[PDB]
Structure formats: structure tokens, C-alpha cells
Design a protein around this nucleic acid. Structure first.
Ligand SMILES: Nc1nc2c(ncn2[C@H]2C[C@H](O)[C@@H](COP(=O)(O)NP(=O)(O)OP(=O)(O)O)O2)c(=O)[nH]1
Ligand SMILES: [Mg+2]
Ligand SMILES: [Mg+2]
Length: 427
DNA sequence: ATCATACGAG
DNA sequence: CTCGTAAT
């Protein structure tokens, strides 16, 4: 009881932009606002692949990884914004710059770990303690949480907003505002700060976002998706047993692939909560020492992964696929594309160095050969001593000359090219 | 025929 | 080091 850790030591939030790429295009082109719309890359093949979908468009069934032509069938009036193309490939610069706008605002409030182009984890433990000291023992008004949902409430003895208020009222009524060490109280204050954060992001960028507040990253991330869009959700330690009782295992971060599938099949279970019935050693025996320990604690709502203080991406890369009959087959083609990638990379690296006082020191070159099922067929690295596209492209070629078979021909033909800058050091 | 863009195991 | 897995 007393010596049992409950994983209520920190206050962690996850802020994720709503239909991010769409909002970026909607801010730029007002004609797209408040309409069914999506972001697509590469129109020629089947209308292009959809990578972002507005909530209005989702109502029609449009989704990610869908061909625009097919989406148009579900939603005839679907509006489409195209990803920029430069040097023969998709260019995501607009989205990276928009992401920076958001990350910089969040970093004002606390240490953040950039988890993706549109979301970041926030460690609000220190901020809440400071906020708690201020306005000590004074009741927290519901007005301070206009967009917050308390998971699992209301409970006990017909409109969604009405439902939200009810739950919120039960939560606040129950709170013990006098004990500054109360974990629930701490989450509540964290929620207040996140309201502030989200208001700042929308006021200063025009972008709306959702957020999750909890004691760790997995629960915060999970909480965030519960009430999107434009809403934030508080998931307390106490709400975990009921929340996890019907939560499919694949919903938890890092359990959506093979590992999650193995848990389900080896253990013969479907929901996260069903994991509590196994001993740590049992879980370790099936999924390894690290995975077993993590599952044992996670199914109980406990996780110790820290919010890493990293606002910038660790790598800068450029990659292009060349499907089916379009696979690269000549020396001239390979070199041309390597140069295109090398040029985009060079501009991206030069800007990075000027903005972030760092320089990449290693260049990674990856390819795929036709007939290979894997994402990558081969990976090779070389020094990156100069930010020059011509040198990097030539170095890259040198590095992959070995795969080619004789004949100016290239074979087997290449289905993918990838250049990635890595191993940054201060500059 | 989606594509383009961190981390642990060995 | 390269590779496989994973999320967005
Ligand atoms: N190329 C590509 N880009 C993607 C993919 N998935 C996501 N993105 C890009 C495009 C996305 O807009 C952005 C954010 O990823 P989310 O947060 O997963 N989705 P969103 O923010 O759109 O909606 P909401 O969060 O409200 O559900 O990342 C993909 O599979 N491929
Ligand atoms: Mg998002
Ligand atoms: Mg996201």
C-alpha cells in the first residue's frame, strides 16, 4: 500500500494540432476554411495520396492513406490542397515552418520534447508547483477550464457540452484544494496551464489544437485523442482501471504493430486492463526484460519515460520513392535524382545551421532495390564535411556504386533513394 | 502504387 | 555500425 509506487510524480501534457496540414493550408487560403478539405501529394496517380483530412471531410469517411479519386467518390465537393513540389519531389517546408511557430510558443511555458511535426510533450511538474504556490488554497473555477474534459465523468446518480460541464463540475466539487501534494489537484492545475497554452497557440498562429493531461506521456497522448478536435482531456490516475478495461491494446503508443499483436496472441487478451493479471516476470518472459517491465507498469497507468528536452529534429532527410515501372535504371537517372535530393538537403542544412548553431557531421545514404519488400534494401554512411550538394551527391553515388550490376545501365533498378544528415555537433 | 518524414537490438 | 519496427 504505502510503498507501492503510483506513478503520480509528474504532470505531463501532450499537445497535438488538429488536422494540422489542412489548417496550415486553410490559414493561407480562407476559401478552404470550414469546409470538407484534405491535403494531397502527387496528383497524377489516382488523384494523389491524402495525408491530412479536415473534420468536415472525415464526416464523409475521407481518411489518411486514401487516393484523392476515391475520396472524391465519398465526398464530391471535397476541396484539395496540394503539397508543394520542388526538384521533382514533395517539399514539406511550409509544414516544418508552421510546426516551428507552434513549438516556439509551447517552449515558452516549459521544457518540450518534439514528438512529431505537429505535437510535443510538455513536463508541467515545475510550472504547476509554482502556480500552486500562487493562488494557494483558493478554489479553481470551472471558468478556468472552458475546454477541458475529465475522463470517466460524469458518473453515478443529452448534449455533449452539457455532459462536459457535468463531469467537470463533479471533478472540481470533489477536489481538495488545500493539499498541494494532491496528484489530482496537480493535474487540474496542469490542465489550467494547458488551456492557457492552447489559447496562446490559437491566438498567435490561428491553429487550433487538442491536448491530453496526465502523469505520463502514454496516458497524455491517449487522453489527447479522446475529445479532438479543439478540446483537451484530463486523465487521472483513478480513471485508468475503467478506461483500460475496454481499451484495445493497439491503441497504446508503441503497441500498434507487431509487438502489440504478439501480446494479444500470446496472452489471449484484447484489452489493456487484462494485462494486470500477469506477473512482471511473466510479461518479461514473453516480451523481454524491458518490454515486460514496461507493460507491467503501463497496464497500471504507470510509465517513467521522461519528457526529453529536445525541440529540434535529430536528423534532416530527403527521400523519394520510384514505384513500379518508374524505378531508376540508368547512371544518369540515379545521379540526377541524388543531386535533386542533395540540393534540397543542402538548403535545409544551411538554414538549420544558421538557425540552430549546429552542423551535421555524417551523411546516411539509403536505397531500395526493385523486388525487395522492405522499406530499405541497403544503408551506408559517409562523412559530411561540407554543405555542398554537388559533393554530397557525388559522395552518395560513390557509396552505392557497389549494388549496381554491369551492362550506362543500373540493375536491379532502384525503387527508392534517401539522403539523411545526422550526428549534429555544436557550431 | 501512397509517401515522406525516432529508436532499440545486435 | 546496419537493420527492423514504429508513429505521424
Ligand atoms: N506523408 C504523410 N504525412 C502524414 C502522415 N500522417 C500524418 N501526416 C502529417 C499530416 C498531418 O496533418 C500531420 C499531423 O499528424 P496527426 O496528428 O497524426 N494528424 P492531424 O493532425 O492531421 O489530425 P488530428 O490530429 O486532428 O487527428 O502530419 C502520413 O501517413 N504520411
Ligand atoms: Mg494532429
Ligand atoms: Mg500528431
Amino acid at each position: 500500500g504505502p510503498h507501492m509506487a503510483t506513478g503520480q510524480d509528474r504532470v505531463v501534457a501532450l499537445v497535438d494540432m488538429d488536422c494540422f496540414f489542412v489548417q496550415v493550408e486553410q490559414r493561407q487560403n480562407p476559401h478552404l476554411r470550414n469546409k470538407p478539405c484534405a491535403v494531397v501529394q502527387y496528383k497524377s496517380w489516382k488523384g494523389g495520396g491524402i495525408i491530412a483530412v479536415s473534420y468536415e471531410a472525415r464526416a464523409f469517411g475521407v481518411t489518411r492513406s486514401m487516393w484523392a479519386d476515391d475520396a472524391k467518390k465519398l465526398c464530391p465537393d471535397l476541396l484539395l490542397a496540394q503539397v508543394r513540389e520542388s526538384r521533382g519531389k514533395a517539399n514539406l517546408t511550409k509544414y516544418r515552418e508552421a510546426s516551428v511557430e507552434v513549438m516556439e510558443i509551447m517552449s515558452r511555458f516549459a521544457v518540450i520534447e518534439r514528438a512529431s511535426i505537429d505535437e510535443a510533450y510538455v513536463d508541467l511538474t515545475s510550472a504547476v508547483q509554482e502556480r500552486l504556490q500562487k493562488l494557494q488554497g483558493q478554489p479553481i473555477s470551472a471558468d478556468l477550464l472552458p475546454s477541458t474534459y475529465i475522463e470517466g465523468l460524469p458518473q453515478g446518480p443529452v448534449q455533449k457540452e452539457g455532459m462536459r460541464k457535468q463531469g467537470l463540475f463533479q471533478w472540481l466539487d470533489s477536489l481538495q484544494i488545500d493539499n498541494l501534494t494532491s496528484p489530482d489537484l496537480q493535474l487540474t492545475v496542469g490542465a489550467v496551464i494547458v488551456e492557457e497554452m492552447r489559447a496562446a497557440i490559437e491566438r498567435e498562429t490561428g491553429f487550433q489544437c487538442s491536448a491530453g493531461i496526465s502523469h505520463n506521456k502514454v496516458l497524455a497522448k491517449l487522453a489527447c485523442g479522446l475529445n479532438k478536435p479543439n478540446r483537451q482531456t484530463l486523465v487521472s490516475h483513478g480513471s485508468v482501471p475503467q478506461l483500460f478495461s475496454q481499451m484495445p491494446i493497439r491503441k497504446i503508443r508503441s503497441l500498434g504493430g507487431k509487438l502489440g499483436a504478439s501480446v494479444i496472441e500470446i496472452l489471449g487478451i484484447e484489452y489493456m486492463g487484462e494485462l494486470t493479471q500477469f506477473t512482471e516476470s511473466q510479461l518479461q518472459s514473453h516480451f523481454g526484460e524491458k518490454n515486460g517491465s514496461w507493460l507491467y507498469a503501463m497496464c497500471r497507468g504507470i510509465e517513467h519515460d521522461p519528457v526529453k528536452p529536445r525541440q529540434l529534429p535529430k536528423t534532416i532527410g530527403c527521400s523519394k520513392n520510384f514505384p513500379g515501372k518508374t524505378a531508376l535504371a540508368t547512371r544518369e537517372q540515379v545521379q540526377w535524382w541524388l543531386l535533386q535530393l542533395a540540393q534540397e538537403l543542402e538548403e535545409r542544412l544551411t538554414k538549420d545551421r544558421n538557425d540552430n548553431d549546429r552542423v551535421a557531421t555524417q551523411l546516411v545514404v539509403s536505397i531500395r532495390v526493385q523486388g525487395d519488400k522492405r522499406l530499405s534494401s541497403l544503408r551506408r554512411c559517409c562523412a559530411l564535411t561540407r554543405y555542398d550538394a554537388h559533393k554530397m551527391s557525388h559522395d552518395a553515388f560513390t557509396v552505392i556504386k557497389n549494388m549496381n550490376t554491369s551492362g550506362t545501365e543500373w540493375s536491379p533498378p532502384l525503387t527508392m533513394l534517401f539522403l539523411c544528415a545526422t550526428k549534429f555537433s555544436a557550431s
